[PDB]
Coordinates of N, CA and C in Angstrom, one line a residue:
Chain A
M1 N 0.8 -1.2 0.0 CA 0.0 0.0 0.0 C 0.9 1.2 0.0
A2 N 2.2 1.0 0.0 CA 3.2 2.1 0.2 C 4.0 2.2 -1.0
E3 N 5.1 3.0 -0.9 CA 6.1 3.3 -2.0 C 5.4 3.4 -3.3
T4 N 5.6 2.4 -4.2 CA 5.0 2.5 -5.5 C 3.5 2.5 -5.4
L5 N 2.9 1.7 -4.5 CA 1.5 1.7 -4.2 C 1.1 3.0 -3.5
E6 N 0.4 3.9 -4.2 CA 0.2 5.2 -3.9 C -0.8 5.4 -2.8
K7 N -1.3 4.4 -2.1 CA -2.3 4.6 -1.0 C -1.7 5.4 0.1
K8 N -0.4 5.5 0.2 CA 0.2 6.5 1.1 C 0.1 7.9 0.6
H9 N 0.0 8.1 -0.7 CA 0.0 9.4 -1.3 C -1.3 10.1 -1.0
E10 N -2.4 9.4 -1.0 CA -3.7 10.1 -0.7 C -3.7 10.5 0.7
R11 N -3.1 9.7 1.6 CA -3.1 10.2 3.0 C -2.2 11.4 3.2
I12 N -1.1 11.4 2.5 CA -0.2 12.6 2.5 C -0.9 13.8 2.0
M13 N -1.6 13.7 0.9 CA -2.3 14.9 0.3 C -3.4 15.3 1.3
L14 N -4.1 14.4 1.9 CA -5.2 14.8 2.8 C -4.6 15.5 4.0
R15 N -3.4 15.0 4.5 CA -2.8 15.7 5.6 C -2.4 17.1 5.2
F16 N -1.9 17.3 4.0 CA -1.5 18.7 3.6 C -2.7 19.6 3.6
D17 N -3.9 19.2 3.1 CA -5.0 20.1 3.2 C -5.5 20.3 4.6
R18 N -5.4 19.3 5.5 CA -5.8 19.5 6.9 C -4.9 20.5 7.6
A19 N -3.6 20.5 7.2 CA -2.6 21.4 7.8 C -2.8 22.8 7.2
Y20 N -3.2 22.9 6.0 CA -3.2 24.2 5.3 C -4.4 25.1 5.7
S21 N -5.5 24.4 6.0 CA -6.8 25.2 6.1 C -6.8 26.1 7.3
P22 N -6.4 25.7 8.6 CA -6.5 26.6 9.7 C -5.6 27.8 9.6
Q23 N -4.4 27.6 9.3 CA -3.4 28.6 9.2 C -3.3 29.3 7.9
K24 N -4.5 29.7 7.4 CA -4.6 30.2 6.0 C -4.8 31.7 6.0
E25 N -5.6 32.2 6.9 CA -5.8 33.7 7.0 C -4.7 34.3 7.9
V26 N -4.0 33.5 8.7 CA -2.9 34.1 9.5 C -1.7 34.4 8.6
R27 N -1.3 33.5 7.7 CA -0.1 33.7 6.9 C -0.3 34.8 5.9
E28 N -1.6 35.1 5.5 CA -1.9 36.2 4.5 C -1.4 37.5 5.1
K29 N -1.7 37.7 6.4 CA -1.2 39.0 7.0 C 0.3 39.1 7.0
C30 N 1.0 38.0 7.3 CA 2.4 38.0 7.3 C 3.0 38.4 5.9
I31 N 2.5 37.7 4.9 CA 2.9 38.0 3.5 C 2.6 39.5 3.2
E32 N 1.4 39.9 3.5 CA 1.0 41.3 3.2 C 1.9 42.3 3.9
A33 N 2.3 42.0 5.1 CA 3.1 42.9 5.9 C 4.5 43.0 5.3
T34 N 5.2 41.9 5.0 CA 6.5 41.9 4.4 C 6.5 42.7 3.1
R35 N 5.5 42.4 2.3 CA 5.4 43.0 1.0 C 5.1 44.5 1.1
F36 N 4.3 44.9 2.2 CA 4.0 46.3 2.5 C 5.2 47.1 2.8
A37 N 6.1 46.4 3.6 CA 7.3 47.1 4.0 C 8.5 47.1 3.1
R38 N 8.6 46.2 2.2 CA 9.8 46.0 1.4 C 9.6 46.2 -0.1
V39 N 8.6 45.8 -0.7 CA 8.4 45.9 -2.2 C 8.2 47.4 -2.5
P40 N 8.8 47.9 -3.5 CA 8.8 49.4 -3.8 C 7.4 50.0 -4.0
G41 N 6.5 49.2 -4.6 CA 5.2 49.8 -4.9 C 4.1 49.1 -4.0
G42 N 4.5 48.4 -3.0 CA 3.6 47.5 -2.3 C 2.7 48.2 -1.3
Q43 N 2.8 49.4 -1.1 CA 1.9 50.1 -0.1 C 0.5 50.4 -0.7
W44 N 0.4 50.4 -2.0 CA -0.8 50.7 -2.7 C -1.5 49.5 -3.3
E45 N -1.0 48.3 -3.0 CA -1.5 47.1 -3.7 C -2.9 46.8 -3.3
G46 N -3.7 46.5 -4.3 CA -5.1 46.4 -4.1 C -5.9 47.4 -5.0
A47 N -5.3 48.7 -5.0 CA -5.8 49.7 -6.0 C -5.1 49.7 -7.3
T48 N -3.8 50.1 -7.2 CA -2.9 50.1 -8.4 C -3.6 50.9 -9.5
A49 N -4.3 50.1 -10.3 CA -5.0 50.7 -11.5 C -6.4 51.1 -11.2
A50 N -6.5 52.4 -10.7 CA -7.8 52.9 -10.4 C -7.9 54.4 -10.8
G51 N -9.0 54.7 -11.5 CA -9.2 56.0 -12.0 C -10.6 56.2 -12.6
Chain B
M1 N -38.6 61.5 -36.8 CA -39.3 61.6 -35.5 C -40.8 61.4 -35.7
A2 N -41.5 61.9 -34.7 CA -42.9 61.5 -34.6 C -43.7 61.9 -35.8
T3 N -43.7 63.2 -36.2 CA -44.5 63.7 -37.2 C -43.7 64.5 -38.2
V4 N -42.5 64.8 -37.8 CA -41.5 65.6 -38.7 C -41.9 67.0 -38.7
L5 N -41.1 67.9 -38.1 CA -41.3 69.3 -38.2 C -40.9 69.8 -39.5
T6 N -41.8 70.6 -40.2 CA -41.4 71.3 -41.4 C -41.0 72.8 -41.0
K7 N -40.3 73.5 -41.9 CA -40.0 74.8 -41.6 C -41.2 75.8 -41.6
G8 N -42.3 75.4 -42.2 CA -43.4 76.3 -42.2 C -44.3 76.1 -40.9
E9 N -44.2 74.9 -40.3 CA -44.9 74.7 -39.1 C -44.4 75.6 -37.9
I10 N -43.1 75.7 -37.9 CA -42.5 76.6 -36.9 C -42.9 78.0 -37.0
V11 N -42.9 78.6 -38.2 CA -43.3 80.0 -38.4 C -44.8 80.1 -38.1
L12 N -45.6 79.1 -38.5 CA -47.0 79.2 -38.2 C -47.3 79.2 -36.7
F13 N -46.5 78.4 -35.9 CA -46.6 78.4 -34.5 C -46.3 79.8 -33.9
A14 N -45.3 80.5 -34.4 CA -44.9 81.8 -33.9 C -46.0 82.8 -34.2
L15 N -46.5 82.7 -35.5 CA -47.6 83.7 -35.8 C -48.8 83.4 -35.0
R16 N -49.2 82.2 -34.7 CA -50.3 81.9 -33.9 C -50.2 82.4 -32.4
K17 N -49.0 82.2 -31.8 CA -48.9 82.4 -30.4 C -49.0 83.8 -30.0
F18 N -49.0 84.8 -30.9 CA -49.3 86.2 -30.6 C -50.5 86.8 -31.3
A19 N -51.4 85.9 -31.8 CA -52.7 86.3 -32.4 C -52.5 87.2 -33.6
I20 N -51.6 86.8 -34.5 CA -51.5 87.5 -35.8 C -52.2 86.8 -36.9
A21 N -52.1 85.5 -37.0 CA -52.8 84.7 -38.1 C -53.1 83.3 -37.5
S22 N -54.4 83.2 -37.1 CA -54.8 81.9 -36.5 C -56.4 81.9 -36.7
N23 N -56.9 80.7 -36.5 CA -58.3 80.4 -36.7 C -59.1 80.7 -35.4
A24 N -58.4 80.9 -34.3 CA -59.0 81.0 -33.0 C -58.9 82.4 -32.4
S25 N -58.5 83.4 -33.2 CA -58.6 84.7 -32.7 C -59.6 85.5 -33.5
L26 N -59.3 85.8 -34.8 CA -60.3 86.3 -35.7 C -60.3 85.5 -37.0
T27 N -59.2 85.5 -37.7 CA -59.2 85.0 -39.1 C -57.8 85.2 -39.7
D28 N -57.5 84.7 -40.9 CA -56.6 85.3 -41.8 C -55.1 84.9 -41.8
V29 N -54.4 85.1 -42.9 CA -53.0 84.8 -43.0 C -52.5 85.4 -44.3
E30 N -51.1 85.9 -44.4 CA -50.6 86.5 -45.6 C -49.4 85.7 -46.2
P31 N -49.1 85.8 -47.5 CA -48.1 85.0 -48.1 C -46.7 85.6 -48.0
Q32 N -46.5 86.9 -47.9 CA -45.2 87.5 -47.7 C -44.7 87.3 -46.3
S33 N -45.5 87.4 -45.3 CA -45.1 87.2 -44.0 C -44.6 85.8 -43.7
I34 N -44.9 84.8 -44.6 CA -44.3 83.5 -44.5 C -42.9 83.4 -45.1
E35 N -42.6 84.0 -46.3 CA -41.3 84.0 -46.8 C -40.4 84.8 -45.8
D36 N -40.8 85.9 -45.3 CA -40.0 86.7 -44.4 C -39.7 85.9 -43.2
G37 N -40.7 85.2 -42.6 CA -40.5 84.4 -41.4 C -39.5 83.2 -41.7
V38 N -39.6 82.6 -42.8 CA -38.8 81.4 -43.1 C -37.3 81.9 -43.2
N39 N -37.1 83.0 -43.9 CA -35.8 83.6 -44.1 C -35.2 84.0 -42.7
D40 N -36.0 84.6 -41.9 CA -35.6 84.9 -40.5 C -35.2 83.7 -39.7
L41 N -36.0 82.6 -39.9 CA -35.6 81.4 -39.2 C -34.3 80.8 -39.7
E42 N -34.1 80.9 -41.0 CA -32.8 80.4 -41.5 C -31.6 81.2 -41.0
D43 N -31.7 82.5 -41.0 CA -30.6 83.3 -40.5 C -30.4 83.1 -39.0
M44 N -31.5 83.0 -38.2 CA -31.3 82.6 -36.8 C -30.6 81.3 -36.6
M45 N -31.0 80.3 -37.4 CA -30.3 79.0 -37.2 C -28.8 79.1 -37.6
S46 N -28.5 79.9 -38.6 CA -27.1 80.1 -39.0 C -26.4 80.7 -37.8
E47 N -27.0 81.7 -37.2 CA -26.3 82.4 -36.0 C -26.1 81.4 -34.9
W48 N -27.1 80.5 -34.6 CA -27.0 79.7 -33.5 C -25.9 78.7 -33.5
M49 N -25.2 78.6 -34.6 CA -24.0 77.7 -34.6 C -22.9 78.2 -33.8
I50 N -23.0 79.4 -33.2 CA -22.0 80.0 -32.4 C -22.3 79.9 -30.9
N51 N -23.3 80.6 -30.4 CA -23.5 80.6 -29.0 C -24.2 79.3 -28.5
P52 N -25.4 79.0 -28.9 CA -26.0 77.7 -28.3 C -25.4 76.5 -28.9
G53 N -24.7 76.6 -30.0 CA -24.1 75.4 -30.7 C -25.1 74.8 -31.6
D54 N -24.6 73.8 -32.3 CA -25.4 73.0 -33.3 C -26.4 72.2 -32.6
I55 N -27.6 72.1 -33.2 CA -28.7 71.3 -32.6 C -29.3 70.4 -33.6
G56 N -28.7 70.4 -34.8 CA -29.2 69.4 -35.8 C -30.0 70.0 -36.9
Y57 N -30.0 71.4 -37.1 CA -30.8 72.0 -38.1 C -30.3 71.6 -39.5
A58 N -31.2 71.5 -40.5 CA -30.9 71.0 -41.8 C -31.0 72.3 -42.7
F59 N -29.8 72.7 -43.2 CA -29.8 73.9 -44.0 C -30.0 73.5 -45.5
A60 N -30.3 74.6 -46.3 CA -30.5 74.4 -47.7 C -29.2 74.1 -48.4
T61 N -29.1 73.1 -49.2 CA -27.9 72.6 -49.9 C -27.8 73.3 -51.2
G62 N -26.7 74.0 -51.4 CA -26.7 74.9 -52.6 C -27.5 76.1 -52.3
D63 N -27.6 77.0 -53.3 CA -28.4 78.2 -53.1 C -29.9 78.0 -52.9
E64 N -30.6 77.7 -54.0 CA -32.1 77.7 -54.1 C -32.7 78.6 -53.0
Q65 N -33.8 78.2 -52.4 CA -34.4 79.0 -51.3 C -35.0 78.0 -50.3
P66 N -35.1 78.4 -49.0 CA -35.6 77.4 -48.0 C -36.9 76.7 -48.3
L67 N -38.0 77.5 -48.6 CA -39.3 77.0 -48.8 C -39.9 76.4 -47.5
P68 N -41.2 76.8 -47.2 CA -41.8 76.3 -46.0 C -42.1 74.8 -45.9
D69 N -42.1 74.1 -47.0 CA -42.4 72.7 -47.0 C -41.2 71.8 -46.7
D70 N -40.0 72.4 -46.6 CA -38.9 71.6 -46.4 C -38.8 71.0 -44.9
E71 N -38.2 69.9 -44.7 CA -38.1 69.3 -43.4 C -37.0 70.0 -42.6
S72 N -37.3 70.4 -41.4 CA -36.3 71.1 -40.6 C -35.2 70.2 -40.0
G73 N -35.6 69.0 -39.7 CA -34.6 68.1 -39.0 C -34.5 68.2 -37.5
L74 N -35.2 69.2 -36.9 CA -35.1 69.3 -35.5 C -36.0 68.3 -34.8
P75 N -35.5 67.8 -33.6 CA -36.4 67.0 -32.8 C -37.6 67.8 -32.3
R76 N -38.7 67.1 -32.0 CA -39.9 67.8 -31.5 C -39.7 68.4 -30.1
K77 N -38.6 68.1 -29.4 CA -38.4 68.6 -28.1 C -38.0 70.1 -28.1
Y78 N -37.6 70.6 -29.3 CA -37.1 71.9 -29.4 C -38.0 73.0 -30.0
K79 N -39.2 72.6 -30.4 CA -40.0 73.5 -31.2 C -40.5 74.7 -30.4
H80 N -40.9 74.5 -29.1 CA -41.3 75.7 -28.3 C -40.1 76.7 -28.2
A81 N -38.9 76.2 -27.9 CA -37.8 77.1 -27.7 C -37.5 77.9 -29.0
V82 N -37.5 77.1 -30.1 CA -37.2 77.8 -31.4 C -38.3 78.8 -31.8
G83 N -39.5 78.4 -31.6 CA -40.6 79.2 -31.9 C -40.7 80.5 -31.1
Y84 N -40.5 80.4 -29.8 CA -40.5 81.6 -29.0 C -39.4 82.5 -29.3
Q85 N -38.2 82.0 -29.6 CA -37.1 82.9 -30.0 C -37.4 83.6 -31.3
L86 N -37.9 82.8 -32.2 CA -38.3 83.4 -33.5 C -39.3 84.5 -33.4
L87 N -40.4 84.2 -32.5 CA -41.4 85.2 -32.3 C -40.8 86.5 -31.7
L88 N -39.9 86.3 -30.7 CA -39.2 87.5 -30.2 C -38.5 88.3 -31.2
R89 N -37.8 87.6 -32.1 CA -37.0 88.4 -33.1 C -37.9 89.0 -34.2
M90 N -39.1 88.4 -34.5 CA -39.9 89.0 -35.6 C -41.1 89.7 -35.1
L91 N -41.2 90.0 -33.8 CA -42.4 90.8 -33.4 C -42.3 92.2 -33.9
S92 N -41.1 92.8 -34.0 CA -41.1 94.3 -34.4 C -41.4 94.6 -35.8
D93 N -41.6 93.5 -36.6 CA -42.1 93.8 -38.0 C -43.5 94.4 -38.0
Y94 N -44.3 94.0 -37.1 CA -45.7 94.5 -37.0 C -45.8 95.6 -35.9
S95 N -44.7 96.1 -35.4 CA -44.7 97.1 -34.4 C -45.5 96.7 -33.1
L96 N -45.1 95.7 -32.5 CA -45.7 95.2 -31.3 C -44.6 94.9 -30.2
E97 N -45.0 94.9 -29.0 CA -44.1 94.6 -27.9 C -44.6 93.4 -27.1
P98 N -43.7 92.5 -26.7 CA -44.1 91.3 -25.9 C -44.6 91.7 -24.5
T99 N -45.5 90.9 -24.0 CA -46.0 90.9 -22.7 C -45.1 90.1 -21.8
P100 N -45.2 90.4 -20.5 CA -44.2 89.7 -19.5 C -44.4 88.2 -19.5
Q101 N -45.6 87.7 -19.7 CA -45.8 86.2 -19.7 C -45.1 85.6 -20.9
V102 N -45.2 86.2 -22.0 CA -44.5 85.7 -23.2 C -43.0 85.6 -23.0
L103 N -42.4 86.7 -22.4 CA -41.0 86.7 -22.1 C -40.7 85.6 -21.1
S104 N -41.5 85.3 -20.1 CA -41.3 84.3 -19.1 C -41.3 82.9 -19.8
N105 N -42.3 82.7 -20.7 CA -42.3 81.4 -21.4 C -41.1 81.2 -22.3
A106 N -40.7 82.3 -23.0 CA -39.5 82.2 -23.8 C -38.3 81.8 -23.0
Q107 N -38.1 82.4 -21.8 CA -36.9 82.1 -21.0 C -37.0 80.7 -20.5
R108 N -38.1 80.2 -20.1 CA -38.2 78.8 -19.6 C -37.9 77.8 -20.7
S109 N -38.4 78.0 -21.9 CA -38.1 77.1 -23.0 C -36.6 77.2 -23.4
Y110 N -36.1 78.4 -23.4 CA -34.6 78.5 -23.7 C -33.8 77.8 -22.7
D111 N -34.2 77.9 -21.4 CA -33.4 77.2 -20.3 C -33.5 75.7 -20.5
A112 N -34.7 75.2 -20.9 CA -34.8 73.8 -21.1 C -33.9 73.3 -22.3
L113 N -33.8 74.1 -23.3 CA -32.9 73.8 -24.4 C -31.5 73.8 -24.0
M114 N -31.1 74.8 -23.2 CA -29.7 75.0 -22.7 C -29.3 73.8 -21.8
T115 N -30.2 73.3 -21.0 CA -29.9 72.2 -20.1 C -29.5 70.9 -20.9
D116 N -30.0 70.7 -22.1 CA -29.9 69.5 -22.9 C -28.6 69.5 -23.7
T117 N -27.8 70.5 -23.6 CA -26.6 70.6 -24.4 C -25.3 70.9 -23.6
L118 N -25.3 70.6 -22.3 CA -24.1 71.0 -21.5 C -23.0 70.0 -21.7
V119 N -21.8 70.5 -21.4 CA -20.5 69.7 -21.5 C -19.7 69.6 -20.2
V120 N -19.5 70.8 -19.6 CA -18.6 70.8 -18.4 C -17.3 70.1 -18.6
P121 N -16.3 70.8 -19.3 CA -15.2 70.1 -20.0 C -14.3 69.2 -19.1
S122 N -14.3 69.4 -17.8 CA -13.5 68.4 -16.9 C -12.0 68.4 -17.2
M123 N -11.4 69.5 -16.9 CA -9.9 69.7 -17.0 C -9.1 68.6 -16.5
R124 N -7.9 68.4 -17.2 CA -7.1 67.2 -17.0 C -5.8 67.5 -16.3
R125 N -4.9 66.5 -16.1 CA -3.6 66.7 -15.5 C -2.7 67.4 -16.5
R126 N -1.5 67.8 -16.0 CA -0.7 68.8 -16.8 C 0.3 68.2 -17.7
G127 N 1.2 67.4 -17.2 CA 2.2 66.9 -18.1 C 3.6 66.9 -17.5
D128 N 3.9 67.8 -16.6 CA 5.0 67.7 -15.7 C 4.7 67.2 -14.4
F129 N 3.4 66.7 -14.2 CA 3.0 66.2 -12.9 C 3.4 64.8 -12.7
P130 N 4.1 64.4 -11.7 CA 4.5 63.0 -11.6 C 3.3 62.1 -11.3
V131 N 3.5 60.8 -11.7 CA 2.6 59.8 -11.2 C 3.4 58.9 -10.2
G132 N 2.7 58.6 -9.1 CA 3.5 58.1 -8.0 C 4.0 56.7 -8.2
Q133 N 4.9 56.3 -7.3 CA 5.4 54.9 -7.3 C 4.3 53.9 -7.0
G134 N 3.1 54.3 -6.5 CA 2.1 53.4 -6.1 C 1.4 52.7 -7.2
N135 N 1.5 53.2 -8.4 CA 0.9 52.5 -9.5 C 1.9 52.0 -10.5
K136 N 3.2 51.8 -10.1 CA 4.1 50.9 -10.8 C 4.3 51.3 -12.2
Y137 N 4.9 52.5 -12.4 CA 5.1 53.0 -13.8 C 6.1 52.2 -14.5
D138 N 6.9 51.4 -13.9 CA 8.0 50.7 -14.5 C 7.4 49.5 -15.3
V139 N 6.6 48.6 -14.7 CA 6.2 47.3 -15.2 C 4.8 47.3 -15.8
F140 N 3.8 47.7 -15.0 CA 2.4 47.6 -15.4 C 2.2 48.6 -16.6
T141 N 2.3 49.9 -16.3 CA 2.2 50.9 -17.3 C 3.5 51.4 -17.7
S142 N 3.6 52.4 -18.5 CA 4.8 53.1 -18.9 C 4.7 54.6 -18.7
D143 N 5.8 55.3 -18.9 CA 5.7 56.7 -18.9 C 5.2 57.3 -17.6
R144 N 6.0 57.2 -16.6 CA 6.0 58.1 -15.4 C 5.8 59.5 -15.9
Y145 N 5.0 60.3 -15.1 CA 4.6 61.6 -15.5 C 3.4 61.5 -16.5
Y146 N 2.3 62.3 -16.2 CA 1.1 62.2 -17.0 C 1.4 62.7 -18.5
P147 N 0.7 62.2 -19.4 CA 0.8 62.7 -20.8 C 0.2 64.1 -20.9
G148 N -1.0 64.2 -20.4 CA -1.6 65.5 -20.3 C -1.8 66.3 -21.6
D149 N -2.1 65.6 -22.7 CA -2.1 66.2 -24.0 C -3.1 65.5 -24.9
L150 N -2.6 64.6 -25.8 CA -3.4 63.8 -26.7 C -4.3 64.7 -27.6

C-alpha cells in the first residue's frame, strides 16, 4: 500500500489540506506585511490601476 | 421623428402664439409674412451655430431657397424654444411689444434647451505632474509623468 502503491500518497495529500486550512488567514497577514514594508510599490497594492 | 417638423410649421406656431394669423382669434394669413418668417428662421439658425451650438438643423444645400415645406430636421423637443425665440425676433415687423408672460415662457423654454446641451469640460492633468510609485510606472504601465495632451 506504500512506496509504488500510492495509497500512502492520498493520506499525505489529505494531511496537507488539513494542515493548510486553519493557518490560512494568519499567513496572509504576514505576507502582506512583508510586501507592504519591502516591495517598492507595495503600499498601494489592491488599488494600483484605479481612475 | 414623430410627425416631422417642417420649416413652415415653426413659423405658423410663432404667428399663432401672438394672435397674428390663426383660426381661433379672428381670421386670416398672408403669403409674404411666410417667406419673411422662413428667411428669418434660416438666419437665426445660422447664427445659433456659435452661441448655443449646433442642434441638428438642416440647411439648404446649394443656393435655391428654404421653402416652408422643407423638413427642418429638429427633434420635436425643441419646437417651443425655437418658436419663442423666432417670435421675439420677428415681433417688431408688426410694431408690437411682448407681454411679460411671453417673455417668461420664452426664457423657460430656452433654459430647457440649454440644459440639454451641457458639456462641463472636466480639465485634465498637466504633463510635468509625476505619477506616484504606487501604480508601478515601470512594469504595469509606462511613462511616469502624465501625458496631459493627446
